[PDB]
Amino acid sequence: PGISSVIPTVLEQSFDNSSLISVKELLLNKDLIHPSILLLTSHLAHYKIVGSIPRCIAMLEVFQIVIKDYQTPKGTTLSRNLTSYLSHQIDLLKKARPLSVTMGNAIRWLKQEISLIDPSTPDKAAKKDLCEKIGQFAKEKIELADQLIIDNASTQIEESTTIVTYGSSKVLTELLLHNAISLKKNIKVIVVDSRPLFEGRKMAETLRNAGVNVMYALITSLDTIFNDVDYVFLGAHSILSNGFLYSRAGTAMLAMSAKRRNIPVLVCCESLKFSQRVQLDSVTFNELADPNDLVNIDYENPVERRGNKGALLNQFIKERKFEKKKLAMENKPKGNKIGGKKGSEGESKDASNEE
Amino acid sequence: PGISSVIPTVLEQSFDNSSLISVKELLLNKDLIHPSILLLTSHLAHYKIVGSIPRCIAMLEVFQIVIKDYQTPKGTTLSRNLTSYLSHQIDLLKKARPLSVTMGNAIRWLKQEISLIDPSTPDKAAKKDLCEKIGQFAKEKIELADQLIIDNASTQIEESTTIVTYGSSKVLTELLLHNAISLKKNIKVIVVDSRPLFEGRKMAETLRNAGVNVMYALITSLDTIFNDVDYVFLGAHSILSNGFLYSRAGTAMLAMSAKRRNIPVLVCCESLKFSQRVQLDSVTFNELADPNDLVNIDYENPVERRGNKGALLNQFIKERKFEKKKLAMENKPKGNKIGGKKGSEGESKDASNEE
Amino acid sequence: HPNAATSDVNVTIDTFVAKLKRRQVQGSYAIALETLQLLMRFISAARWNHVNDLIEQIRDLGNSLEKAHPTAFSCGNVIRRILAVLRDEVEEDTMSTTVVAEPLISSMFNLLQKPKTDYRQVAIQGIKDLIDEIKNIDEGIQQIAIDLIHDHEILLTPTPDSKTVLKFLITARERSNRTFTVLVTEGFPNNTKNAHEFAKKLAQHNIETLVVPDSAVFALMSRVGKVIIGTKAVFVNGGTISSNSGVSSVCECAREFRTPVFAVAGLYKLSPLYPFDVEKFVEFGGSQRILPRMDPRKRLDTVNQITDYVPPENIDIYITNVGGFNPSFIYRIAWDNYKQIDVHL
């Protein structure tokens, strides 16, 4: 059946609409669930590496694995309880960590596929062709697109560069790595780190693993870092029907700063991340997590100090809340690198109707 | 003392910084109150003409009259209960309607005067010179100051000008009259008026009575007349020690519009209007009146009509609240013509130390 | 001028220097107090005979102190104030010794045109007055301070390091009729613990407290009503040095949204010297606190700073013990406390 109720810490007065609670340690579940989904959920819940791009790929891989493992029952057809199973999986995912736009798209695609082939064909012939098709799709709309984006970026970069970067966006890491290795230009990389997830640190580590000249900074230290420095790059999660940048935590402020100090910002996005859902603020739907992330006192993740703070429930009238997904302003980013080479962010849903 | 508490209309959830109601109809009054004060109170309660400048003059006149009527008693000295009486008067005034900075200044001056003359001089000789002194003061800080303001305006205002004005500030009216008759110039005077007060209308009427081309303007139709307009003067009430104009009704909007569309805003002010008290928004100290003024259909002030409106407590939660005095911004009004000739609004209290 | 003249007469200078260098002394107030004490010691013990020479000596001492530590502004300020106090008295004395018209309190044309007493006691009294002033600032702010914040309004608080700002907040919170929601920005490399402490204090006081990370400033900005700075030093044109980390960006954001930006500090923190360079006055922090290891961290050059500088364009209000002032007006206040020649030493 699962688990219900029992939530840690205060519920707060403001920003109460989305799930923030749940299974962290498993106790009593339905005896039919494939464990790979559960494992994935466990990973996603306590993840520090993933950021919009790889999650969907991982999900796809999991689905493929499931298909490979899937065996049709002797009585009922191929699609009878499969849909129910899928629904259950979705519910589990939501309980663990809310579904992204890419994930939704993937789900839609899966549904379409299900509709395409009606229950009449044998087992070993259908899924052989399905898995191949899915692989082909993956090759087409993801990796190739990424490659195209990279190549576009390559021509767009001039001579003598000093760049400030943020996030654990895989595409950006790929880009920077490419710059370092195959282009052999005068590239300087400055990294910004955030409190909820150590993405900046990871980026820095990756850079080190290549051998790049790295400056390391935070959200607070920005007034002195400019005083020569030109380009600013950000990692996007999804672009809505309005045209606003619906992305991760510390991006919008950086963009604003860039705008203030002359030189504009450039953001990268895929040709599948676009959504039909309409929202213009972070209050509508937001990725909210447990206040356990904002407990550690600086330095590193595993330290555990008995300093000043370490209580939430016992404290009378105290609201410790943090947000993960933000909505950045429309006019501030100028450059968008998508499947159609180059374009403005004001296009919004030009690819959505195109499909 | 009279009547206190028990008043219609709710306290309201939004905007409750000042007390909202006070005596209007005379019943059971103390047998020592001078009738001129009472009459003034009756007037102010439902006034259409006066605003900041003439009010203070009227008050001064009343005070002079009181002094003339006052004689030193055999038992009590000249400085024994006069101060108490003054305090009582002030309290009455406050109860009736909130007061200006000029009035306060006048009160302070009076107090100073009281201290200055020692109770030893002949009584007849004392008040003889007192009333003369007060007259002199009035001539200096009002009439002479007005003249100075006029002269300042003269050098700055070009040949054939279009002036857009708001309210019923006497100084501005005087200036316009001067422009019309004494100097003889081509003037186009656009006057804007609101719903609860017909001050603009009155101004227009006065202009007509002289022989000036007047355009009647409204809050609903503002942008149509600007898009031509070269010079804008606002109805001044008090300048704060930050650089903000605490003024009557929708002047802030006008100022904003001016800022947007080419030309800066000009303000004419008295040397004694300045305040050392500081505030930066309309929420701080609001001047309130009864919602009874906005019940009837417009046309004229006294109508008494049967229609639809006339419910404050009868219907399911109905609040009909309005503000009389708002805040004008800092950077938008730059021009200030005072008793010390020239200065800007950024120069907040440079004249306050000079006196 | 070296320390050859002062060795057995005054010894505490070295101790003061030590306190400055290795940061044994903490909080600008404490520094100011120390400076005052030093001045008192100088006055009670040393010999003068002449007045101009004494003044020169004092100036030299001030210069030396400045050279020893530039980030200690309060120390400088106090000295300057003392000099100003001395100067007026000296001027008065000269007029009696010899045995004038002015439109205002100070004249510009007097510089162009050619122009024993018990002054020691007066000087001593000046120090006492200064001490008294230092003692209470919050009492002269609260009469103006608890007039701005209203019901159902939301406050945003960068820099909770200052002791005055907290007090100001507390005084506002005391009132039963007033209710407000508080958003607190953390400040990672310098302000975190302090911020936490502030939050705890707020909780104790029984007010609605919201702890906000440095990245989540943008999302809540549609609801933000007012901005308050925990500044450490005030200057001539309006620009201020803030008490470490996470102030500039927030101010910029406020400016963008046209949110009112308040500042509470005091006139002892106010300096008659100009902040011509950000790089000269602002001191930087430590690299060790951010990231562990050393051998790979030779490649990873980390940038982190203590103090923060905010331009005068963003900040509009400077409420002190005297009253409410502007960045366009505060210069005059400084002049009223520090004289014309006393600026350069």
Nearest-5° angle of CA A183, CA A184, CA A187? 100
Residues from chain C contacting residue A299 (CB–CB below 8 Å): 289, 292
Do residues C231 and C243 touch, judged by C-beta distance below 8 A?
A: yes
> Residue A59 corresponds to which amino acid?
M
Cα gap C85→C127, rounded to integer Å: 9
User: What residues have CB less than 8 Å from C174, skipping those under 6 apart?
Assistant: none
Instruction: Find the domain containing C26 and state its range.
Output: 9-135
Task: Select from C299, B83, B316 the least CA-distant residue to A209.
Answer: C299
B282–chain C Cβ distance below 8 A for any pair: no
Residues C123 and C143 in one domain: no
Residues from chain B contacting residue C179 (CB–CB below 8 Å): none
CB contact under 8 Å between C248 and A223, yes or no, is yes
CB contact under 8 Å between C329 and B281, yes or no, is no
Residues from chain A contacting residue C192 (CB–CB below 8 Å): 297-298
C16 in a domain, yes or no?
yes
Residues C165 and C292 in one domain: yes
Cα gap C283→B126, rounded to integer Å: 68
Residues from chain A contacting residue C302 (CB–CB below 8 Å): 215-217
Provide the sign of the torsion angle of the four alpha carbons C61, C63, C68, C69, taken in this order: positive
Among C187, C214, C300, whose Cβ lies nearest the Cβ of A214? C300
Packing angle between helix C12-21 and helix C28-45, nearest 10 degrees? 170
Do residues B244 and B207 touch, judged by C-beta distance below 8 A?
A: no
Cα gap A96→A50, rounded to integer Å: 15
Residues C125 and C26 in one domain: yes
Classify A140 as helix, strand or coil.
helix
CB contact under 8 Å between C329 and B348, yes or no, is yes
Q: After which residues is chain C broken (C to N over 2.5 A)?
A: 99, 115
Task: Select from B83, B80, B107, B91 the least CA-distant residue to B30.
Answer: B91
Residue that finishes a domain, picked among C76, C106, C135: C135
Q: Closest residue of B to C325, CA-based?
A: B242
Task: Provide DSSP, A90-123.
Answer: HHHHHHHS---HHHHHHHHHHHHHHHHS-TTS-H
Cα gap B109→B22, rounded to integer Å: 27
Do residues C247 and C158 touch, judged by C-beta distance below 8 A?
A: yes
C344 in a domain, yes or no?
no
C106–chain B Cβ distance below 8 A for any pair: no
C150–chain B Cβ distance below 8 A for any pair: yes
Cα gap A159→A181, rounded to integer Å: 16
Cα gap A13→A315, rounded to integer Å: 15
Cα gap C163→C158, rounded to integer Å: 13
Provide the sign of the torsion angle of the four alpha carbons B175, B180, B185, B189, taken in this order: positive
Cα gap B33→C245, rounded to integer Å: 63
Task: Select from C246, C261, C278 the least CA-distant residue to C318.
Answer: C261
Task: Select from A247, A194, A235 the least CA-distant residue to A217.
Answer: A194
Task: Provide DSSP, A191-204.
Answer: EEE-SSS-HHHHHH
Tell me the β-bridge partners of A174: none
Tell me the β-bridge partners of B247: B326
Task: Select from B16, B128, B12, B140 the least CA-distant residue to B67.
Answer: B128
Cα gap B126→B297, rounded to integer Å: 54
E strands, C103-244, in order: 153-157, 180-185, 209-212, 226-229, 231-234, 240-242
Residues from chain A contacting residue C153 (CB–CB below 8 Å): none
Residue that finishes a domain, picked among C135, C160, C187: C135
Cα gap B237→B267, rounded to integer Å: 10
Query: How big is chain C by its Cα radius of gyration, in Å?
Result: 23
Do residues C81 and C129 touch, judged by C-beta distance below 8 A?
A: no
CA distances from C168 to A172, B100, B305, C184 (A): 46, 29, 53, 15
Residues C79 and C153 in one domain: no
Task: Provide DSSP, A212-246.
Answer: --EEEEESSTTTTT------EEEE-SEE-SS--EE
CB contact under 8 Å between C208 and A299, yes or no, is no
Cα gap B324→C141, rounded to integer Å: 29
CB contact under 8 Å between B279 and C144, yes or no, is no
Query: What does the H/E/C string look like for chain B?
Result: CCCCCCCCCCCCCCCCCCCCCCCCCCCCCCCCCCHHHHHHHHHHHCCCCCCCHHHHHHHHHHHHHHHHHCCCCCCCCCCCCHHHHHHHHHHHHHHHCCCCHHHHHHHHHHHHHHHHCCCCCCHHHHHHHHHHHHHHHHHHHHHHHHHHHHHHHHHHCCCCEEEEEECCCHHHHHHHHHHHCCCCCCEEEEEEECCCCCHHHHHHHHHHHHCCEEEEEECCCCHHHHCCCCEEEECCCEECCCCCEEEECCCHHHHHHHHHCCCCEEEECCCCCCCCCCCCCCCCCCCCCCHHHHCCCCCCCCCCCCCCCCCCCCCCCCCCCCCCEEEECCCCEEEEEECCEEEECCCCCHHHHHC
Residues C159 and C256 in one domain: yes
Do residues B307 and B260 touch, judged by C-beta distance below 8 A?
A: no
Give the CATH number for residue C222.
Answer: 3.40.50.10470
CB contact under 8 Å between C291 and A294, yes or no, is no
E strands, chain C, in order: 153-157, 180-185, 209-212, 226-229, 231-234, 240-242, 261-264, 300-302, 308-310, 317-319, 324-325
Cα gap B51→B166, rounded to integer Å: 12
Residues C261 and C300 in one domain: yes
Say what the resolution is, in angstroms: 10.1
Residues from chain C contacting residue B283 (CB–CB below 8 Å): 150
B330–chain C Cβ distance below 8 A for any pair: yes
Counting Cα atoms < 13 Å in the Cβ hemisphere of C164 gives 31
> Residue B123 corresponds to which amino acid?
D
Q: Closest residue of A to C199, CA-based?
A: A318
CB contact under 8 Å between C316 and B278, yes or no, is no
Query: What distance in Å separates residue C332's CA from the closest CA in chain B?
Result: 9
Do residues C269 and C319 touch, judged by C-beta distance below 8 A?
A: no
The percent helix, strand, coil of chain C (3-state, each to 5) is 45, 15, 45
Task: Select from A329, A90, A345 the least CA-distant residue to A243.
Answer: A345
Cα gap A281→A19, rounded to integer Å: 17
Experimental method: cryo-EM
> Residue A266 corresponds to which amino acid?
L
Nearest-5° angle of CA B193, CA B196, CA B202? 45
How many domains does the structure of chain C reveal?
2
Question: Chains B and C: how many Cβ contacts under 8 Å?
Answer: 38
Residues from chain C contacting residue A283 (CB–CB below 8 Å): 219
Cα gap A176→A187, rounded to integer Å: 9
Residues C53 and C73 in one domain: yes
C1 in a domain, yes or no?
no
C214 in a domain, yes or no?
yes
Cα gap C288→C59, rounded to integer Å: 39
CB contact under 8 Å between B283 and C144, yes or no, is no
Among B243, B284, B349, whose Cβ lies nearest the Cβ of C147? B284
Residues C147 and C129 in one domain: no
CB contact under 8 Å between A224 and C203, yes or no, is no
Counting Cα atoms < 13 Å in the Cβ hemisphere of C96 gives 9
Tell me the β-bridge partners of C184: C157, C211
Cα gap B229→B114, rounded to integer Å: 50
C85 in a domain, yes or no?
yes
Cα gap B172→B234, rounded to integer Å: 9
Q: Which burial class, exposed, middle or buried, applies to C254 when counting CB atoms under 10 A from its CB (0-12, 13-18, 19+)?
A: buried
Give the strand pairing for C300-302 and B325-328.
Answer: unpaired
User: What residues have CB less than 8 Å from C263, skipping those under 6 apart?
Assistant: C228, C229, C231, C234, C240, C315, C317, C318, C319
Cα gap B63→B69, rounded to integer Å: 10
> Residue A257 corresponds to which amino acid?
S
C341 in a domain, yes or no?
no
CB contact under 8 Å between C203 and A298, yes or no, is no
Report long-range pairs for A310-316 (Cβ below 8 Å, ≥24 apart): A312/A8, A312/A9, A312/A10, A313/A8, A313/A9, A313/A10, A315/A10, A315/C203, A316/C203, A316/C206
Residues C141 and C281 in one domain: yes
Do residues C282 and C305 touch, judged by C-beta distance below 8 A?
A: yes
Do B and C make contact via 3 or more CB pairs under 8 A? The reply is yes
Give the strand pairing for B265-268 and B333-338.
Answer: parallel
C274 in a domain, yes or no?
yes
Q: Closest residue of A to C287, CA-based?
A: A216
Do residues B135 and B126 touch, judged by C-beta distance below 8 A?
A: no
How far does chain A reach from its first CA to its final CA, in angstroms?
38
Task: Select from A95, A84, A77, A75 the least CA-distant residue to A26.
Answer: A95
CB contact under 8 Å between B242 and C316, yes or no, is yes
Cα A346 → chain centroid: 22
> What strands, in cross-sheet order, belong to the sheet with B238-239?
B238-239, B245-248, B325-328
Query: How big is chain B by its Cα radius of gyration, in Å?
Result: 22
Cα gap C241→C71, rounded to integer Å: 10
B241–chain C Cβ distance below 8 A for any pair: yes
Token output for B334 = 């730059």
CA distances from A230 to A224, A226, A235, A245, A335 (A): 14, 9, 17, 21, 14
Task: Select from C338, C307, C263, C229 the least CA-distant residue to C70.
Answer: C307
For the beta carbon of residue A229, count every other beta carbon within 10 angstroms: 17
Of chain A residues 55-94, which have a CB less than 8 A from chain C?
Answer: none
A145–chain C Cβ distance below 8 A for any pair: no
Residue that finishes a domain, picked among C105, C135, C165: C135
Interface test with B, best of C143, C144, C146, C151 (most B CBs within 10 A): C151
C176 in a domain, yes or no?
yes
Nearest-5° angle of CA A302, CA A305, CA A306? 150
Residues C46 and C130 in one domain: yes
Interface test with A, best of C206, C215, C280 (most A CBs within 10 A): C215
Do A and C make contact via 3 or more CB pairs under 8 A? The reply is yes
Looking up tokens 């003067």 gives B233
> Residue A152 corresponds to which amino acid?
N
- Using CB atoms, list chains with 3+ pairs below 8 Å to chain C: A, B
Residues C275 and C141 in one domain: yes
Residues C131 and C162 in one domain: no
Give the CATH number for residue C70.
Answer: 1.20.120.420
Cα gap A264→B233, rounded to integer Å: 40
> Residue B216 corresponds to which amino acid?
Y
Token output for B285 = 């100290």
Q: Which burial class, exposed, middle or buried, applies to A205 when counting CB atoms under 10 A from its CB (0-12, 13-18, 19+)?
A: middle
Do A and B make contact via 3 or more CB pairs under 8 A? The reply is no
Do residues A61 and A142 touch, judged by C-beta distance below 8 A?
A: no
Cα gap B252→B257, rounded to integer Å: 9
CA distances from C86 to B69, B286, C45, C269 (A): 54, 47, 17, 20
Cα gap A179→A185, rounded to integer Å: 7
Interface test with C, best of A223, A283, A306 (most C CBs within 10 A): A223
The torsion angles phi and psi of B267, rounded to 5 degrees, stand at -135, 125
Token output for A209 = 């693993």
Cα gap B27→B39, rounded to integer Å: 14
